[PDB]
Amino acid sequence: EFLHAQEEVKRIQSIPLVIGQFLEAVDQNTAIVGSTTGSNYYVRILSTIDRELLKPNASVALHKHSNALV
Amino acid sequence: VSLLSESYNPHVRYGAAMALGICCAGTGNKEAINLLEPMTNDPVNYVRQGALIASALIMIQQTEITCPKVNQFRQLYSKVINDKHDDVMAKFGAILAQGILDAGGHNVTISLQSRTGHTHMPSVVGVLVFTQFWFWFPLSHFLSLAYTPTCVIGLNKDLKMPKVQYKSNCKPSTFAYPAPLEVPPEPNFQLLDNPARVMPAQLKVLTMPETCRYQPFKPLSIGGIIILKDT
Amino acid sequence: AVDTAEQVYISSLALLKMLKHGRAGVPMEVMGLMLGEFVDDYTVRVIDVFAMPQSGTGVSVEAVDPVFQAKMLDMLKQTGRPEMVVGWYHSHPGFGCWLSGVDINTQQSFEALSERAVAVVVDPIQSVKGKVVIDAFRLINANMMVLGHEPRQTTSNLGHLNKPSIQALIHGLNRHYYSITINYRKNELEQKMLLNLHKKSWMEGLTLQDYSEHCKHNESVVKEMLELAKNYNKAVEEEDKMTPEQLAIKNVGKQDPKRHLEEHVDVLMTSNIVQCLAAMLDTVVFK
Amino acid sequence: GLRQYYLSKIEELQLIVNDKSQNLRRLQAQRNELNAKVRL
Amino acid sequence: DQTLKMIKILSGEMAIELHLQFLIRNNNTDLMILKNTKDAVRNSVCHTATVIANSFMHCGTTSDQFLRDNLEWLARATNWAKFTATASLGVIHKGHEKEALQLMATYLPKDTSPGSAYQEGGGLYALGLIHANHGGDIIDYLLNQLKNASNDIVRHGG
Numbered sequence: 001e002f003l004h005a006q007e008e009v010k011r012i013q014s015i016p017l018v019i020g021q022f023l024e025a026v027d028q029n030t031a032i033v034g035s036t037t038g039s040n041y042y043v044r045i046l047s048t049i050d051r052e053l054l055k056p057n058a059s060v061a062l063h064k065h066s067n068a069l070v
Numbered sequence: 071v072s073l074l075s076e077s078y079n080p081h082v083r084y085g086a087a088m089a090l091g092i093c094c095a096g097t098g099n100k101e102a103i104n105l106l107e108p109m110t111n112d113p114v115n116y117v118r119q120g121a122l123i124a125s126a127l128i129m130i131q132q133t134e135i136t137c138p139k140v141n142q143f144r145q146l147y148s149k150v151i152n153d154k155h156d157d158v159m160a161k162f163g164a165i166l167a168q169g170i171l172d173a174g175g176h177n178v179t180i181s182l183q184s185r186t187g188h189t190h191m192p193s194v195v196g197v198l199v200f201t202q203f204w205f206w207f208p209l210s211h212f213l214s215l216a217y218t219p220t221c222v223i224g225l226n227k228d229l230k231m232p233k234v235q236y237k238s239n240c241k242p243s244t245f246a247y248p249a250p251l252e253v254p255p256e257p258n259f260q261l262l263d264n265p266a267r268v269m270p271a272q273l274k275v276l277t278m279p280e281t282c283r284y285q286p287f288k289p290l291s292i293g294g295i296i297i298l299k300d301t
Numbered sequence: 302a303v304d305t306a307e308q309v310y311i312s313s314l315a316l317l318k319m320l321k322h323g324r325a326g327v328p329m330e331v332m333g334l335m336l337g338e339f340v341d342d343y344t345v346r347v348i349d350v351f352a353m354p355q356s357g358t359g360v361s362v363e364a365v366d367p368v369f370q371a372k373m374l375d376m377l378k379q380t381g382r383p384e385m386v387v388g389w390y391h392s393h394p395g396f397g398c399w400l401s402g403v404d405i406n407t408q409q410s411f412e413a414l415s416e417r418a419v420a421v422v423v424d425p426i427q428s429v430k431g432k433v434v435i436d437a438f439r440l441i442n443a444n445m446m447v448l449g450h451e452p453r454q455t456t457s458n459l460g461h462l463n464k465p466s467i468q469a470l471i472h473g474l475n476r477h478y479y480s481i482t483i484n485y486r487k488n489e490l491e492q493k494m495l496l497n498l499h500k501k502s503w504m505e506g507l508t509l510q511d512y513s514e515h516c517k518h519n520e521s522v523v524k525e526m527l528e529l530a531k532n533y534n535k536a537v538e539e540e541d542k543m544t545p546e547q548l549a550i551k552n553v554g555k556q557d558p559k560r561h562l563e564e565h566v567d568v569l570m571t572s573n574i575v576q577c578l579a580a581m582l583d584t585v586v587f588k
Numbered sequence: 589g590l591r592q593y594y595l596s597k598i599e600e601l602q603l604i605v606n607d608k609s610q611n612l613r614r615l616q617a618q619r620n621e622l623n624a625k626v627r628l
Numbered sequence: 629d630q631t632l633k634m635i636k637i638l639s640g641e642m643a644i645e646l647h648l649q650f651l652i653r654n655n656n657t658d659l660m661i662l663k664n665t666k667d668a669v670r671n672s673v674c675h676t677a678t679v680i681a682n683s684f685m686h687c688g689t690t691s692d693q694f695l696r697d698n699l700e701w702l703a704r705a706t707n708w709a710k711f712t713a714t715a716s717l718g719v720i721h722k723g724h725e726k727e728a729l730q731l732m733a734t735y736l737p738k739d740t741s742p743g744s745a746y747q748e749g750g751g752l753y754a755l756g757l758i759h760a761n762h763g764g765d766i767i768d769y770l771l772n773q774l775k776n777a778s779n780d781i782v783r784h785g786g
Binding site: 148151152158162165166168169170172173174175176177178192207208211213214215217219221223228247248250252265267294295 | 636642643646647649650651653654655656657658660661664665667668672673674676677678680681682683684685686687688689708711712715716719722753757760761
Binding site: 008011016051 | 427549553554
């Protein structure tokens with residue numbers, strides 16, 4: 001059952017997707033990004049991303065309306 | 071079932087709550103009320119619903135002394151029934167539980183069990199048919215087969231009522247009434263008439279009639295009707 | 302009236318025609334017909350689905366000549382058995398599911414002849430592998446919206462089970478239409494014969510695997526597994542140190558040994574235990 | 589003589605209780621961690 | 629007597645009306661509890677939810693003053709509440725032979741004949757509710773009416 005819900009979470013990874021850039025993280029599973037609309041945001045992340053592929057200065061995908069890490 | 075109250079789907083989280091509601095319903099169980107305390111807080115509406123019906127079945131004809139969580143929950147159904155922002159399914163359990171918890175003027179109760187060890191099979195049907203209210207609303211209207219009284223009744227001839235008055239022995243605050251509010255130095259010698267309601271836990275705390283004209287030939291251990299031999 | 306326990310049975314067959322036609326022309330709103338079989342005032346059954354040639358714009362999509370419609374239904378009566386149009390669908394591309402201001406208009410045309418034309422949205426983007434988000438709808442009168450009167454007279458504990466999205470709630474739900482709970486008609490007629498027909502193979506496992514290179518691949522992993530264990534001969538040594546909740550946030554730039562070091566152990570096992578066992582059966586079976 | 593034998597058998601039947609429950613104590617906590625992983 | 633013994637113990641009728649005698653003497657309820665829940669008048673489930681409340685808390689006591697306080701709020705909801713409004717009438721009269729046909733004399737299906745046949749078709753549902761485990765005419769008064777009737781709108785209650 002966990003593997004069925006494991007793949008279900010990526011429906012948020014749909015097509016109208018905007019681009020930010022990783023800046024830092026406060027703690028576990030919550031970070032700070034900067035969109036390409038100029039304004040920075042304090043966003044929640046998505047759990048399945050390997051955290052150890054982050055911060056040189058990473059390109060990240062962001063949600064369209066809610067604008068969280070994708 | 072206490073492990074199954076934390077399942078991932080709300081469906082197993084639902085039927086875990088009725089599983090406590092159909093087993094321990096005759097008793098004011100300390101442990102079953104302990105489990106249903108956070109069950110009314112879940113974001114799924116029908117598990118908030120079925121927790122209330124299970125909270126209704128656990129404490130019928132019980133006033134504050136079998137467990138203190140009776141009047142802690144009398145306020146709880148009124149807390150959710152007077153909100154506007156609550157869901158209709160969520161507050162449907164509160165309005166249903168008022169008819170459960172004050173059943174017959176606290177004169178009838180559920181009984182899946184006799185003193186003989188044999189089960190009460192119309193109540194076995196009457197609670198199982200009560201489970202299917204999702205798919206048809208008056209299908210769970212078959213609930214009167216589970217409602218059975220708790221009253222000792224005296225008798226001496228085929229028709230005649232006796233006139234006997236006995237009393238209690240243990241702590242007297244068990245015999246409380248609902249006592250409605252209507253806004254616009256102690257017993258343990260409680261006399262009782264022949265149609266006298268009594269809790270099944272209170273069957274031991276009473277006194278046999280020793281000074282009256284009447285004396286029971288039967289050892290008074292079960293309620294209902296018995297012969298009361300005129301001596 | 303209705304009881305909000307409508308329970309639309311569809312199929313196992315129609316939804317693949319829904320998504321394939323919905324996704325082959327995905328960014329345009331494609332649409333079609335729903336050709337089914339009516340049952341009582343409560344439920345409805347939609348069994349077959351076909352589309353038409355259409356002409357569209359960005360915000361609108363139309364149909365073309367009606368001679369396609371009658372000639373299509375004549376050929377489906379003579380081949381198979383006749384049916385009746387239970388409704389119609391369309392396809393929001395990557396939106397969600399709601400009735401827009403033009404989607405509501407041709408629904409209003411179809412609800413006149415039969416009053417139970419089911420309006421269906423399929424989104425072939427939001428559907429990843431599991432949820433297929435569908436959420437069939439039907440109109441409610443805006444005359445009773447003027448009355449302030451709440452319709453549909455809930456008489457079963459079946460409607461208020463699935464919660465609507467906020468984005469569909471921004472749109473006309475719930476001021477001009479409602480949602481319907483649905484499920485799928487499943488049977489051994491079909492369910493057994495898509496399971497036991499799709500993911501099947503014949504020789505992929507009675508064969509060996511590049512015999513000079515499997516043992517070579519048994520060094521292509523182990524060689525860097527030495528230095529990956531040298532990092533595991535490194536990272537434990539900096540423990541009894543700064544409060545390893547700090548050793549979660551800090552190590553997000555680079556790869557840890559510990560998780561990566563059990564990663565290859567599964568790979569270096571099943572690559573070997575399969576290839577060793579499958580070789581030792583051909584010694585018995587083949588002479 | 590007779591019942592003398594029976595208190596042998598109550599006390600070594602109880603030896604299955606203290607470790608299989610201890611196995612279940614280990615096992616039931618493992619599910620609670622995994623169900624917390626799922627719902628989250 | 630010992631000849632009369634098989635009626636006194638196997639029909640068991642003196643456990644029925646004596647239980648009715650217990651309920652007609654002992655009845656400790658409140659009207660305000662329904663009046664506290666009166667303020668949820670809308671088009672929601674609440675009309676069916678209050679009539680399923682007073683039926684459970686008045687089983688077999690024949691006390692129709694909680695229901696006869698009004699007419700229009702009871703007759704606001706339609707098409708299945710009126711199936712249940714005539715269903716809740718039998719639970720209040722549970723276990724009593726006389727006040728079954730006589731109080732439902734308005735609710736026989738061939739007397740008033742309104743546009744709602746669930747109001748009159750759900751009466752035979754309540755005739756089963758009173759005489760559960762009690763089979764006499766009540767078997768055959770419900771047997772002959774199902775020989776010729778309407779569709780499965782009275783045949784549910786039948």
